[PDB]
Each structure stands twice: as C-alpha cells, then as structure tokens.
Amino acid sequence: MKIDESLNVHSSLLQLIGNTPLLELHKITKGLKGRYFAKLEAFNVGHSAKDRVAKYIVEDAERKGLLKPGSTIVETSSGNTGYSLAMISALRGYRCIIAISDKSSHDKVEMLQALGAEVHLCPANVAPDDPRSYYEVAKRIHNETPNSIYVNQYFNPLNPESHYQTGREIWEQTQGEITHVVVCSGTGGTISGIAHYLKEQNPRVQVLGVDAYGSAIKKYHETREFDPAEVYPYKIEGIGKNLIPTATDFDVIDEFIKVTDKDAALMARKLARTEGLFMGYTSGAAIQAVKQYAEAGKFDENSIVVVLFADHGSRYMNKIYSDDWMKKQGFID
Amino acid sequence: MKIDESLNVHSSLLQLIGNTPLLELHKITKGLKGRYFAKLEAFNVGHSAKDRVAKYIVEDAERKGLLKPGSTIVETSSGNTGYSLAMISALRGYRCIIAISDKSSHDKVEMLQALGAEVHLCPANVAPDDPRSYYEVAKRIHNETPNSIYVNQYFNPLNPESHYQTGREIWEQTQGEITHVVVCSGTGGTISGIAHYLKEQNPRVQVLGVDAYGSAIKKYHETREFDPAEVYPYKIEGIGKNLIPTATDFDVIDEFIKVTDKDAALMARKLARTEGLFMGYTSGAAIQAVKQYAEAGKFDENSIVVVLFADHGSRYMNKIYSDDWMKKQGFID
C-alpha cells in the first residue's frame, strides 16, 4: 500500500499544515457590500496559523543541521507559536522550552505541558527589556542551553516568509479576484507574508490590519515612531504589541484599525452563535474590524474580502467563552 | 468568482465534515507488527466524528420537511453530538436543546452554550429510565416542544448509516489493504457503519471494538444478555454504555476489549508527547486497545491496522490533561 495526498493519506503530521479552507460567509456579514470569505487557519493540525511558522522555521533549522533528536527549541510565545513548536518538538524528539506571560490563561500553559514542553511563566506587565519578561527569559535560556535554537518570531524574517504560502492559497482560492484582505497583526508575519504574495500578483489589493487598544502598531504604521503613550495592558492575546517587531512589514500594509477588547469578545461570541464558527479572540477582532472597515466605506458591491481567522475558540474557554470572565471585564451584564 | 472544492473553497460549513486525514503512525506503535494508521476525525469542523452523525440526521430531517428556521433540535448527549448539533443549529437558525449528564466536565457545557444551545444538566448516576436521566429529560422536552425533533442517537438507525461513508474513506485511503480496524464503541454508530462498508468489500477485515470497565457492551456482544453486574460508573466519556443501543450492530463486530480509565488516560498523554497528536480520552483508549490487541497476537507483519481517533484533546483540559485531576483519580502520583 502507498500514501496518496488527494486520498488525504499522510506519512507525517507536518503535511497536515497549510492548504486550509476558504469559507464564504453569509450571515455574520449580512448587509455588507460585496462577498466575504474566511480563511480558516484553525484547520491546521495545531489549530492555528502558527503551525506554518513553526514548520517553516523548524524545517529550515533541520536543513541547516541545527536540530537533531535531543536538541532544544526555545521560544517566547503567548500560546499558539509555543503550541505548534511543542507539537513538532514532541514528534521530532526535541526538547521544547517556552517562555509565556501570565496574560495568557492557564489553559494554554497546560496544553503546552501536555505536549511535553517546559514552560516558564513570566509577569506580563513588565517592559520588553526587563530581564523578567518572556522575551528576555527565553533569550537567557537559549544562551544557557547548548544545542538550542531561539525561534524569536517577533524578529525572525522566516516568520513572514512562511506566510507567503498563505497568500498564495488566498490568491488561488479567490481565483485572483480578491480585493481586500483583513488580518490581525501580532508579530505581523501573517499579514506581511500574505501581503507580499498578493501585492506581487496585484498591487491594487488592499491589505488591512487590525490592532488592539494598548498597542504601538497602528501609530507606528502611520508615524514610524514608537509612542509609549500608545502602549498599555489589554486583554486580547495575539494582536498588537508593546514593541515594534521587524517581522511586520509596514510598507505593504495599506491601513490599520483598532478594535476594543470588548467588541472583539462580543463579536467572537456572535460569530459562534450566527455562523456556528467557534473561533478565537482575534477572529472576533478580525470580524469586528471588517464591520468597522465596512462602515468607513472600504468595500463595495464588487469587493472580494478575505478575513483571516487565526485560531480556534476552544483555547478561550476561560476568557471570552466564560460568562464569568466576560462579566468581570464588564463586557456583559 | 466561483467555488472550487479542490482549491478547498466552500460555500457551507457543512462541507467541512468528512474526508478526514489518515495518518501513518511510527512512534506510538513502535515495535508492533504491521503498519498502523490513525483516522483523524478531529479534523471535522466540529472536532469530532459526531459531525457526520449531526449532518446526516439534520439533512435527513430537512429533506423530510421537519426542520425550518425556528424549529427545535433536541438531543441527549455527553458532549460531542450535542456540540455538532448546536454548531449546525447555530448556522441554520434552529433552537438546540441538549440534555447532558454531570459526568461531563463543565468545559463541554460552556462550549454548547457558546454555540447558543440550551443545556439541561442531569445527574449521571441514575438508571436510564429514571425520569431525571439525560435520556428521559430530552424525551420530555421533545414531547413538550412543538416543531421539534429528537435525534436519539443511541436508537437512531441514521447514526450508523452516517458512518458508512467513514468506512468508504478508510477503504479507499488504505487502497483496499486494511486488515483490522480498531474503534471505540459508544452508541456503536461509528464502528457499525465502518464495519458495514468494510465487510461488504472484504469480509475478512477484522472489526475490533473497545469498551470501558463499567459498561455492558462487551458482555452483551459475547452473550447477547444485558448484565447489570457489568454496569457501574466510570470516567471515560463517549465509550461504553449503561444500556444496549440499537445503533450498535453486534453481528458485524468481531471482538470487543476493555481498557481501564487509567490506561486510556495515560495513553492519551503518551500519544500527545510521542506523536504530537493532541487527542481525546477515547483516542487514548483506542491506542491502548491496539497495544492490548497486539499483545494478544491479533496483528502480524502483513497487518494494515486503522485506529479511529474520535475527537480532540482540547475538550479534556479539566480531565486527562489536568495533572490535578489525574492525581485525584490516582492515575499519576
């Protein structure tokens, strides 16, 4: 017997990454102009878009001889990148060490540990250069650990490179008809890699980012200056940042918009109840951003709008899908 | 622009059900004879094999005129079937009412509510005919509710019928070479529908079921008598039963084997750490059963063994992937 990929038969979990569904939306986008499609990155085996980053960077390190059974992968992550790296590390027999901040719910920490990762919990509300931060904890661990790599997704050019293929998929799945893409920006690797592919096929495609309140990204996109007044703690994970990642290519992004923690959380809940799509916090942010962009007039009857849904609702049971947590934030009565 | 299914472009979430991956395993099955493949039903949009049941029964009811926007779908479920029905009910605008027993962790209840389902929590340790049970609570709600259906998966012949296609996939994905299939049996719909397709193509295919300690299924399979001594509370959800479902076709199942709550939980954890496959409690049971069947001599160097992995690890964060819960059961020190 042999292994056929159109029979959906696979020799490695790594082949269950990429080529995710594009699904047309009709209900959550009711009464907007144009057609709307969701790129469902939760269908990756690791349940987020970060599977592509982890695969691409691990395979690159393997090709460079830097990883063998027993080697160590170190990374700073709020959850998804660490999960994908720990998933691959479990398969390959790598030691995986993740620095995570306590902004993330304990659910994500226990997922990482189920995959066999060593987790270092770090205080969230410290400066990036504070030696207690999850950025600096991971750099130390890397320096102290021989036969280790530091993925460093915020400053690793392989990150947006891995999402060139995401853009290729979006381009082919819309048959070259896409006019706008809406993508939340964390490291910025997803939006930038997508933008690189799409702008090369058609520079008129509008690349629209989503930012959080409390993040420096939008202001930097408009002024190219890091404004500390823009930075303060917020509750959405995986969107926005308290520093400027070089993984973000600000020159290919046409516009940024901010969405509140509250509206993103309510929109994630509304998406689940309306479309049956049980998606993560940033998917709620992304759909809310589509609503805000639409009210600002970005789309017309000829628009072909793709919105990236980065991860799955099952990782947010102690946040936006917990009525107690929502009440405690004041997002619901 | 048009919608192409090999571009993975879809007009409805319902098309993201079925045609799941078959993945060859090399590490968890190290040193067993033959080749081993996992059928990954967690890749359904609803993250379990029950997506197929829900789709098939809803579409059948729609074809029969029994469901329109505002109609009500009632079901008895421990989690997965209710999730899939609530997911579809959210999309279609049906009211979804689920009777669930408090054997299920509160995680599953909150997932159901995120999809907009009305949940009735029921005491677990009551007889099936006790009016407090989740079987009888759902039948009452159905009788009290006009424009409602009662899915009744334990006694609904559409249940194993929906898994005829699962068997067809397994048959094509192994190119007709499968010699054994290992499937946990709850309602029995999955194993029976799979067995119906496979035995019709090749009656020599061995259909091997997995049962829990505390369930009547294995004894009934061997004696065709319901033995109450076989029934007592246990911790694995979605395998075994305290009654005899007619959804189980005992005549196509070659053998049953029991796995302990402890070994299934440890094997789920070992599967995650070894293969990076983060799967549910019954996947741990299924892999443990493969180990037990292998030690009993069921497989040789020419065996082509498919093991069904029914759902995803992310639904078991408060059980087998919680070190506290495992310590409390005595499964780990």
Query: DSSP states of B47-90 as a string?
Result: SBTHHHHHHHHHHHHHHTT---TT-EEEEE-SSHHHHHHHHHHH
Distance in angstroms (rounded) separating the CA atoms of residues A150 and A190? 20
Cα distance between residue B151 and residue B97, in whole Å:
11
Give the number of other Cβ atoms within 10 Å of residue A54's Cβ: 30
Chain B residue with CA closest to A27: the answer is B91
Report yes or no: B301 at the A interface, CB cutoff 8 Å: no
- DSSP, collapsed to helix, strand or coil, labels residue B165 as helix
Question: CA of B218: how far to CAs of B201, B248, B254, in Å?
Answer: 26, 11, 11
Residues 6+ apart with CB under 8 A from B34: B179, B299, B300, B301, B302, B303, B304, B305
Please check whether residue B134 is in contact with residue B120, taking contact to mean a CB–CB distance below 8 angstroms: yes
How far is it, in rounded angstroms, from Cα A191 to Cα A207? 8
Judge contact between A92 and A111, C-beta under 8 A. Answer: no
Tracing tokens 């020419």 back to the chain, one arrives at B302
Q: Rounded CA gap, B63 and A287, in Å?
A: 32
CATH number 3.40.50.1100 given to B67-153? yes
Ordered DSSP codes for A69-135: TT-EEEEE-SSHHHHHHHHHHHHHT-EEEEEEETTS-HHHHHHHHHTT-EEEEE-SSS-TTSTTSHH
d(CA B59, CA B124): 31
As beta bridge partners, residue B292 has none
**Pairwise CB contact (< 8 Å): A174 & B43:** no
Q: Report d(CA B191, CA B209) in Å as an integer.
A: 7
For residue A31, give every residue at least 6 positions away whose Cβ sits within 8 Å of its Cβ, in sequence order, or none. Answer: none
Chain B interface includes A10 (CB < 8 A)? yes
Q: Angle, to 10 degrees, between the axis of helix A106-114 and the axis of helix B261-275?
A: 80
**CA distances for A126 relative to A136, A233, A244, B197, B293, angstroms:** 11, 10, 16, 59, 54
Pair B38, B184: CB distance under 8 Å = no
Distance from CA of A153 to the nearest CA of B (A): 21
A266 touches chain B (CB under 8 A): no
What residues of chain A lie within 8 A of the CB of B266, using their CB?
none
CA–CA dist B296, B290 (Å, integer): 10
- DSSP assignment of A182-216 equals EEE-SSSHHHHHHHHHHHHH-TTSEEEEEEETT-S
**A30 at B interface, C-beta within 8 A:** no
For residue A288, is it left (φ>0), alpha (ψ between -120 and 50) or beta? Answer: alpha
A305: which DSSP letter? E
The secondary structure of residue B184, as a DSSP letter, is E
Q: Return all residues near B109 (Cβ < 8 A) that are at least 6 apart.
A: B100, B119, B121
Domain boundaries, chain B: 13-43+164-329, 67-153
Tokens representing B120 are 């009735």
Give, in words, the CATH class of B13-43+164-329: alpha beta
Q: How far apart, in whole angstroms, are the C-alpha atoms of residue B325 and residue B304?
A: 36
* Whether A273 and B35 lie within 8 Å, measured CB to CB: no
Rounded to whole angstroms, the Cα distance separating B13 from B190 reads 21
What is the C-alpha separation between A64 and A152, in angstroms, rounded? Answer: 17
Torsion angles phi and psi, residue B108, rounded to 5? -65, -40
CB distance from B11 to chain A under 8 Å?
yes
Q: CA–CA separation, B257 vs B240, rounded Å?
A: 11
Nearest of B98, B308, B279 to residue B186 by alpha carbon: B308
Q: Which residue has the tokens 């990204």?
A: A217
Residue located via tokens 């290919």: A252
The β-bridge relationship of strands B180-184 and B304-309 is parallel
Chain centroid, CA B5 distance in Å: 26
DSSP letter at A298 equals -
B165 vs B180: CA distance, rounded Å: 17
**Dihedrals phi, psi of B136, to nearest 5 degrees:** -80, -35
Q: Which of A172, A165, A173 is nearest to A22 (CA)?
A: A173
Joined together, the tokens standing for residue A223 give: 């002024």
Q: Tokens 């029934």 label which residue?
A: B231
The DSSP symbol for B229 reads G
Q: Which of A27, A30, A39, A50 is catalytic?
A: A50
Tokens 């069947």 sit on residue: B293
CATH class of A50-155: alpha beta
Are domains B13-43+164-329 and B67-153 of this chain identical in fold?
yes
Q: How far apart are CA B152 and CA B155, in angstroms?
A: 6
b/e A183-195 (16+ beta carbons within 10 angstroms → b): bbbbbbbbbbbbb
Give per-residue burial for A200-215: e unless 16+ CB within 10 Å, then b.
eeeeebbbbbbbbbbb
Residue with tokens 């719910």: A105
On the 0-12 / 13-18 / 19+ scale of CB atoms within 10 A, A20 is buried
Enumerate the H helices of A157-296 as residue ranges. Answer: 158-162, 164-173, 189-201, 217-223, 261-275, 281-295
Q: Which of B173, B302, B323, B327 to mutate to test the interface with A (most CBs of A within 10 A)?
A: B173
B156 token code pair: 């609904």
Q: Strand pairing of B9-10 and B72-76? A: unpaired
Alpha carbon distance A74, A117 (integer Å): 10
For residue A212, report the phi and psi dihedrals to the nearest 5 degrees.
-95, 160
Integer Cα distance of A32 and A12 in angstroms: 41
d(CA A134, CA A264) in angstroms, rounded, equals 25
The encoded tokens of residue B7 equal 């571009």
Largest CA distance in chain A: 62
Count of Cβ atoms closer than 10 Å to residue A127 Cβ: 14
Which residues, other chains included, contact B55 with Cβ-Cβ below 8 Å and sequence gap of 6+? B14, B17, B18, B84, B88, B162
Containing H/E element for A51?
Answer: helix A50-63
Q: Are A259 and A289 in contact (CB under 8 A)?
A: yes
Distance, first Cα to last Cα, chain B: 59
Question: In terms of Cα–Cα distance, which of B37, B23, B22, B21 is closest to B299?
Answer: B37
Angstrom distance (rounded) from CA B293 to CA B306:
13
Distances (CA, A) of A170 to A15, A166, A181, A218, B185: 19, 6, 9, 24, 40
For the four alpha carbons of A23, A26, A31 and A35, in that order, the dihedral sign comes to positive
- Clarify whether A39 is annotated catalytic: no
Structural fold of domain A13-44+163-329? Rossmann fold (3.40.50)
Selecting from A10, A90, A276 the residue whose C-beta is nearest the C-beta of B88 gives A276
All residues at 6 or more sequence positions from A295 whose CB lies less than 8 Å from its CB, including other chains: none
- Other residues' Cβ atoms within 10 Å of the Cβ of residue A4: 13
Q: Which residues pair with B212 in a beta bridge?
A: B259
Sequence-distant (≥ 6) Cβ neighbours of residue A324 within 8 angstroms? none
The residue behind tokens 């040193």 is B31
Which of B109, B89, B91, B111 is closest to B101 using CA atoms? B109
Q: What is the number of residues in chain A?
A: 333
Across the interface, whether the CB atoms of A275 and B21 are under 8 A apart is answered: no
Structural contact between residues A153 and A76, judged by C-beta atoms closer than 8 angstroms = yes
- Angle, alpha carbons B101-B102-B106 (nearest 5°): 115
Strands A22-25 and A35-40: antiparallel
Structure tokens at A21: 């569904």
For A21, residues 6+ apart whose C-beta sits below 8 A from its C-beta are A39, A40, A43, B8, B9, B10, B16
Q: Which chain B residues contact residue A111 at CB under 8 A?
A: 278, 313-314, 317, 321
What Å resolution does this PDB entry report? 2.1
- End-to-end C-alpha distance for chain A, whole angstroms: 59
φ, ψ (nearest 5 deg) of residue A180: -145, 145
In the sheet that holds B148-150, the strands lie side by side as B118-122, B95-101, B72-76, B148-150
Choose among B223, B226, B192: nearest CA to B208: B192
Please calculate the CA angle B166-B169-B174 and round it to the nearest 5 degrees: 130
